[PDB]
Design a protein around this ligand. Structure first.
Ligand SMILES: Fc1cccc(CNCc2ccco2)c1
Length: 460
């Protein structure tokens, strides 16, 4: 039975409003309702992996797992296996997989991050899961960020704390946060970004929503505008939103948005908003395609509607050769030539690189670079042809061209990373000098660039 080179992944996010779900929630897992929806002809085809994020979830883990598994069994006639479940307060993630994948999944990690201090610590944060699916690392984050139209900056801060402190994936990737540890990272939840229009415009916004005219609302969505200004979710993707705002509804119908200030809201307005979102970040030149992104119309127990997204995701096999794993294959080499980092830092330490990849036996430290001044004020660190030749474990081009090199530039004085990035080995040619590029980030914010040329030798 052949190992897959593609899987499909379902991502759900639902803020349950502290209420038990209705009897039937199958529309969620079927990607049916508003937005980019799934074709009826696929309804019996199971996704390979289902990842369910809830917020304000009132159920026990046992109670929710019985509902989820019985829902999927009814849709697909498949009894899913539980990969992982993790709950922080009322924020939960469940990962379910088809039984045929049980042998393919390993290295399962879970973690959480509590956001805020004192006042602001006690209910917001994130939970996450990671695992290996054959040769492909997968990460999932469900976050419930700070509420309130006025608190977009707090939400951005919550995002940076979560990516800094959530400990998922391979701990040997010490310089790298979750935004570099995974082939595919999905980040979803009640992100709580709002449509930033005046309170007086509430009824006008509702009118627009009834006409299905979302353009002048989306132009004011705080997540889209903060992303466009590079304040949050740098280098993540989101499918276009084509569904109505998913918050704040009167319960037991979807006919009414309940936006007016009440004692129960702390006297805050909740204008209709796309609080509930799915974003992703995949390594360069890996197949990832969003095949649905939408909200259900028939699950009405909460003041939010559930959101679904589905993806095709490229995966690779657990490769064995006569040589690696367990040794190098000397018919393989990676050379980084005429490379230089451009850094936004004002420090004047010397810098070295680290190259990390599961195609290497262990990470490789470079010699220090040569620092020069950039013409517009910046530090340029030149590496020349000084960089160590990387010795992959397997030389077969069917393996090596699917790999990635993580790069960290580190201070010689402190050993702290000043920037992290990723280079694909999915080259147009082998045995040929080709341009390479990655932005460099630290704590998820842009700190520089790394560029130069690569020369890849495979056994072919
Ligand atoms: F999908 C899953 C659901 C539950 C557990 C696991 C872990 N399976 C580990 C393993 C054994 C042999 C090869 O891989 C996977």
């Amino acid at each position: 039975q052949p190992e897959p080179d593609m899987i499909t992944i379902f991502i759900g996010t639902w803020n349950m409003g502290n209420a038990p779900p209705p009897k039937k929630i199958t529309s969620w897992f079927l990607s049916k309702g508003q937005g980019k929806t799934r074709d009826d002809s696929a309804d019996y085809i199971p996704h390979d992996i289902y990842v369910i994020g809830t917020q304000e979830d009132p159920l026990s883990e046992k109670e929710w797992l019985e509902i989820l598994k019985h829902s999927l069994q009814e849709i697909t006639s498949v009894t899913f296996k539980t990969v992982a479940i993790h709950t922080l307060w009322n924020i939960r993630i469940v990962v379910l997989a088809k039984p045929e994948h049980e042998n393919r999944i390993s290295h399962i990690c879970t973690d959480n991050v509590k956001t805020g201090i004192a006042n602001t610590l006690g209910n917001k944060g994130a939970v996450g899961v990671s695992f290996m699916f054959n040769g492909t690392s997968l990460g999932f984050v469900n976050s419930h960020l700070t509420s309130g139209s006025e608190k977009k900056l707090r939400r951005n801060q919550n995002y940076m704390n979560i990516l800094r402190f959530l400990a998922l994936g391979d701990k040997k990737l010490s310089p790298f946060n979750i935004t570099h540890r995974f082939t595919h990272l999905f980040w979803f939840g009640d992100l709580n970004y709002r449509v930033d229009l005046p309170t007086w415009e509430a009824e006008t916004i509702i009118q627009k929503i009834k006409q299905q005219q979302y353009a002048d609302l989306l132009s004011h969505d705080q997540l889209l505008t903060e992303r466009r200004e590079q304040k949050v979710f740098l280098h993540f993707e989101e499918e276009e939103i084509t569904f109505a705002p998913t918050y704040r509804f009167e319960r037991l119908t979807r006919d009414k948005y309940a936006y007016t200030k009440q004692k129960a809201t702390g006297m805050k307005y909740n204008l209709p908003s796309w609080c509930d979102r799915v974003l992703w970040k995949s390594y360069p030149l890996v197949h990832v395609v969003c095949q649905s992104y939408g909200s259900t119309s028939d699950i009405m127990t909460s003041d939010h509607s559930p959101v679904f997204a589905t993806f095709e995701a490229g995966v690779t096999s657990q490769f064995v050769s006569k040589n690696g794993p367990g040794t190098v294959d000397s018919q393989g080499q990676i050379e980084f030539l005429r490379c230089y980092a451009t850094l936004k830092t004002k420090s004047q330490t010397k810098f070295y690189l680290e190259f990390h990849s599961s195609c290497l036996e262990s990470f490789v430290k470079s010699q220090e670079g040569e620092n020069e001044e950039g013409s517009e004020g910046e530090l340029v660190v030149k590496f020349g042809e000084t960089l160590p030749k990387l010795k992959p474990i397997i030389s077969d081009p069917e393996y090596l061209l699917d790999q990635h090199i993580l790069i960290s530039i580190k201070s010689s004085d402190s050993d702290e990373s000043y920037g992290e990035g990723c280079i694909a080995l999915r080259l147009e040619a082998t045995e040929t000098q080709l341009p390479i590029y990655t932005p460099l980030t630290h704590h998820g914010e842009l700190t520089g660039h790394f560029q130069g040329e690569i020369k890849l030798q495979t056994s072919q």
